[PDB]
């Protein structure tokens, strides 16, 4: 599979838009965790399936298919909510109903925070101009980096090489090629720093019985 | 848990 | 100035071994906790020294300059330990009389899941082989990638520059290169999982009652 | 504190 054709088996993999779903009602802490937790709880159903449309990703062991999912969730939650509000400064669009600004998360307490993080890197992914097909490679590069190994370290390496390969398609200098992937490489930490703050913050409002025990997202969140 | 199910079931 | 001369100035600011020194006594959750904040504190008053020894670090803005060791030294910290762990699988060499086994790890709770992952990050350097100047470089990146914008934004530049330079003095291929590039770079998400893991352990041991922390590991770890 | 007075007095 050239590094073309695997960006195109991502293109086809990618999971459907999550719409909220809600009858009205203005901003509390405990409806808003409500809000995020629904919307997350949806995608999770989704992002399983998206996993399981990446080549290779079934040829791994259980094992592994469930250690890289359950590691990395909140990380490709967040990837895909950056990715959404890159267009849109000072604003985080969960959904096409549910645009949250930055002022809006004094609501929760732990979650203004975590609403800055973000929206700093997605103002990063903004000024770098971050393309769809970057996304894509970043986002599968995010699944698979949370850690038989050796079809871990070939598929890693595939996606790897189609990031690489969707930079050179820009004609940029081998010099900035490299700086680009540097660049877009370094933002993977901040990504790691937001989700290991929501996860702990998730967390936090089941210990507080602000949002109740869930199904697939208290799996995640657990295990 | 629901992870084993959808991973192991196709589709 | 340039990647060269940058190397030669990171290789030359090196901070100073530190060691522990400390009468005979076995491990407790008390003692082991109590032997990393002594070592710690020590390891950031050197951290700062090396810090603005950083070619063009004093010239950033003061808020800068802290926000930037105040956000990473638990990183750094970490990197620091893994670097001198890489040639000796299964250990945390902390200090030269502290080397500690993975097992050594079941003294305090929540110290053996940190452990486990600095050891499984310090085996992936070790399987890549990180030479010197690409750890020198990578630890200089994780301070500077932590967080006048421009100043700042240049300096990590440099420092990336400065890392693609080193990786192009071996006599791999293009293809090799952004690959090393870019198995390096993921690993940055590791060390901020591990160092997250790591200020949440240390927050829990303060409001437990476990250990006293010390001056500066205090004024690090409140901001 | 500790930090402004030893990245501001040097050396
Ligand atoms: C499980 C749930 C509460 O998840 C979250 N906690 C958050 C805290 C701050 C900002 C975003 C957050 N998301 C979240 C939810 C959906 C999404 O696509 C991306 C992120
Ligand atoms: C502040 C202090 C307690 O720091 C730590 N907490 C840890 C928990 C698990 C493993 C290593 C840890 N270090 C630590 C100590 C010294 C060092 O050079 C690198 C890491």
Redesign the interface.
Known sequence: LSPEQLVLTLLEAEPPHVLISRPSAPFTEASMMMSLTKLADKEL?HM??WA?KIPGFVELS?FD??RL??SCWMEVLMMGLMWRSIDHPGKLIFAPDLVLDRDEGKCVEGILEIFDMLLATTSRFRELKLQHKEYLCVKA?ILL?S?SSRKLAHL??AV??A??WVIAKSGIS??Q???R???L??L??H???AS??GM?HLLNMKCKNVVPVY??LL??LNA | ????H???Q??
């Open positions: 159903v399983i399936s399981k259980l298919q469930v999912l359950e590069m980096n850690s890693l390496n790897t090489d990031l690489v081998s010099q090629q490299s700086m992937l540097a660049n490489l370094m993977l930490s990504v790691r720093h290991n703050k702990e199904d697939l799996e995640m | 848990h629901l992870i084993l959808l991973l192991l196709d589709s």
